[PDB]
């Protein structure tokens, strides 16, 4: 067994309490050399002549270089010390613990979880366990109001192919007039983009961040949307810009005329004094050349308490819950104590968070409650739309993903297609529906939060910026009602197998030659399985049981398929086809 | 290269600031597997025409089954994703990063450290990283004035034996009469034991966290203390206990007597209503049976201020520096908001935690500054008393040891070799005082912060609590000057020889059999190297000269060692001696 390969922390992603009296613990190994990880675990002080008790670690997942076991450590007492014994294939026993390994118990030493204290058992808002949301650009959504319009407004068409600044005009009553859509759908938040009064098309340059911005509507009109959507079941998330602030902002400004002497001065981060807002931007902004960014110092103790009074606002409005724009970027220090304040106005205020890179720093428990899922993008364009990668790749990269964070975030990181940055999910399967709908078949059975962007459910295909950001086609000849069914058929699934959001996820068949993948996501008793056929051609497929127990199986989308011959469940799928088969139970 | 075994990660210890510009990146890898380490590095936001910066990653050590790599990458801009080229023995070239492994750069990804604050360089009190600590367990330092007394009390001589019972005088206003020692032996800090009023010869179930304990002093004894000190240029650290409180103590006293009216019942987790003192023992508890000590709720916000109140007081009293006992059973929100409050209130206070099972999750920099260094309490034990470890060992549990907190962390953790409740370390060095010298020599050059227990300085020879806490022996007559001379000689080395307070330590020699280990200690042109010839016989080692350069090296101890022939330098050294030789820059 090579023991430099195998893998435990006391800490973090690999050990965490569920619960005050249950500690989960984690553990990696090469693929292939540990073939049965067993915990051995007793109270922090429990005295020598004690038998332990004991708790077997199952195998969770195996990505590409790595099997995953993950165990469940009752710890009544909230205090728990442990040490894993590890079994070999060739039967080689080792024992690992903080020493070191061993094969003599003691002198591997102990790891040890020092106590459970509840608030550290990360707890997310129970809502957002079992959601669809759906990704409003309000600018192109719809224009409700065309009194609102900036000047120079294009007509809405499905002719439309934007450019960069151009307005079609797409506001706060749009929506509400749409909402009886959205929530036919199925869809239980929206989640906007930012809405605050800004510059530019797109409002990411704020300038002010008390007040809906003057083309999409204002304090009225958001509170008539926030609750009449609240009202059909939608909540409202917010996007959250805090990282750095527009040009056209108060301080920014008072430091632009006054400079030194603004009591705003050191509000942002300064080596251009004066001001050079047009000819040598670097004074810190964005990233070096952009010039009406400059960041926000969310360390200064008054920009932090603007930006909660910002927070609390917009909470007072009705909002509940933040997607954290660069989040990354601002100190971890506010967002500690951002958690505090937005868990107090709202219990179930979310706070969701964007950084592209690994989130864990954030994960812990303390800072937001999930993140964009952006691995979920790369793996589903290329399993299902590029092809590039095949099933067995598909397992690797969904598997090595999930186990980057404590399961409370991974349940409900944002599992998202596309999004207004980059080109749109049917241009990414190059206009091949087949293609689409197993990706969103896969979408909708997968561990996480279903996020639809603006005009997917009726079929709109975009190149990135601005292409994606077409208006969105409302008329009902003009819309993929094939696809529409679908989503609402999927999203009704969602929500009534409680296994498909609230369930842990297996995976059951992985072939790179045929191309199919197939899942289980399990509660208690209930499976569901989804087999999903990756293939432009036909193929039977045969496949084991899932653990306990199923003889017959239902698929959920059309009928029986108890096929169960005491181990084999054999099943034929036709083109793209994927099946959701589900215990009855 | 066994791909399984490296690791990197973007946080913790293997990645964090310097300062704003620097991070130190660390890279763990199964020993022998990779020779050459590089970092290539851009600023986040920079385009792909650029050239990545370079910066090679030395060997930073290697412990029994991995080599470390660590690199300094200067990120002007904050903001740093990095690749790793690997390197390894028969040539492959890896590219490591977040992606993966691939031969190929872009398949491997760029690590991301997405933006680095003042905020979040861990800082460290100055002085601490110079600091000598004295431990007094003030019960036994000295008798000042009988006044003091509890009666019942023994004899002040060698001869007294301590039982568990008894008491022997000892208070504060001994030490105000004993600092002139105190500041010929050279010690920079005292730090005291529990000294808060209570009823038992353990104060830890502290009855009265607000004043002294009757038989120690009283607010004016300890606040001149305090001051004569200061003008001695050594300063208070003080034992706190905020985990549990005692039976007595006046918020608890109010469900003694007051069942269910008592204000205070969610001060407590209370199992069985009501105090259980005598009926039996459970409720939440330091430990299994023991009787005094119910458990703070610290989590409590109405707790938590009190035990700030605390603070706050004696922090007004003008002490330096909290340790902090348990530390590990209370919550990191606690923690956290306390850091922020000692460092608001002093900037320079130390605040040191006592976890015996790694603590990291503490060692962060929001947290506390150190742990008591368990590992070198047992590293020298065996190494230098118990014989039960040779030198590749020692340097083995050592470099495991020195790489597993973020550097800042490293330099202040106390090097203790013995506590009032251990064994007295010449009993566990067998009573041989050439022995114990050598783990002297060791203590005052390596990097971490010496704690001096009562008496060692003195050849005080004993035993598990009680024998430990024998009374400190005063009568020239009746000490090791001889001892006390040499300690004297190495604290003063340590304060003139920067890089033994504040330099980087790399193992320099560790030959298994002749049981001579030696090390470097650096800063800038400056190398320090110690040659511990841990054997009990005079050999003769050829060591490699180090990086900077040194032809000739004086030997600090005792006169120069020119015997830089080319590279090697030829050291004859005699039974247990450890040298300490300084290259002069
Ligand atoms: O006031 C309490 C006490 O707090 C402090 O103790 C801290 C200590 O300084 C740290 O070193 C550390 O302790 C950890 C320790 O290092 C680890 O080795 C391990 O401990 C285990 C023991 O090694 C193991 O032997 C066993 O314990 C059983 C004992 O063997 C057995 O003798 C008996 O224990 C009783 C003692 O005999 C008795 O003397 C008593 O202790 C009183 C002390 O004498 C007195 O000085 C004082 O101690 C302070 C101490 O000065 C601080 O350093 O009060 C004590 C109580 O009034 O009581 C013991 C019964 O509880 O029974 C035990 C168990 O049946 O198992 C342990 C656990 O595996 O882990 C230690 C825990 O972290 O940390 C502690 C603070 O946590
Ligand atoms: O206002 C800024 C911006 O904020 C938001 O963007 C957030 C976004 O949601 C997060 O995902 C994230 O970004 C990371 C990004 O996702 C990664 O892809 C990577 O991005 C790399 C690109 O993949 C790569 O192609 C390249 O980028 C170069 C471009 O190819 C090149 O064209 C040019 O980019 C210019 C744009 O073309 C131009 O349109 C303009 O961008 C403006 C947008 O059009 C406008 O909508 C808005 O942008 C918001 C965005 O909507 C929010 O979602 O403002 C933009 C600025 O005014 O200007 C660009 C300037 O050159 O140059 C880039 C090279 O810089 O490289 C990148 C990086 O290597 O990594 C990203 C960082 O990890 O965070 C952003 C917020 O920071």
Redesign the interface.
Known sequence: M????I?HE??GSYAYPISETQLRVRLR??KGDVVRCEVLYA?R??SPEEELAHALAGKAGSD???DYFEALLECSTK?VKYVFLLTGPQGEAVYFG?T?FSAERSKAG???Y??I????VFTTPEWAKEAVIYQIFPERFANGDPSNDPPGTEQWAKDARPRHDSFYGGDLKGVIDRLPYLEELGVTALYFTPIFASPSHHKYDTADYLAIDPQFGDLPTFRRLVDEAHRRGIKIILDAVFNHAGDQFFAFRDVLQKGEQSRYKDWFFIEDFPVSKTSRTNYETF??QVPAMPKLRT?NPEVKEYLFDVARFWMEQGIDGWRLDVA??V???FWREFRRLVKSLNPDALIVGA?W??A??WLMG?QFDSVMNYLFRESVIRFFATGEIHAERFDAELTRARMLYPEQAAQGLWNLLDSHDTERFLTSCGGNEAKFRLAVLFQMTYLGTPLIYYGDEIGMAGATDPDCRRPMIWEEKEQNRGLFEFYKELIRLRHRLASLTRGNVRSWHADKQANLYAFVRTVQDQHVGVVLNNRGEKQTVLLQVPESGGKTWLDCLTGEEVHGKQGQLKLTLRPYQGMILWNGR
């Open positions: 090579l023991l430099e390969a893998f006391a800490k190994a090469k109270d002080y429990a590409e270089r790595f205090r903080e070191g102990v790891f040890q020092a106590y204290h509840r608030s550290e990233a070096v360390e990354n970027e100190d971890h220090a950084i890179h690994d864990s720093g303390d």
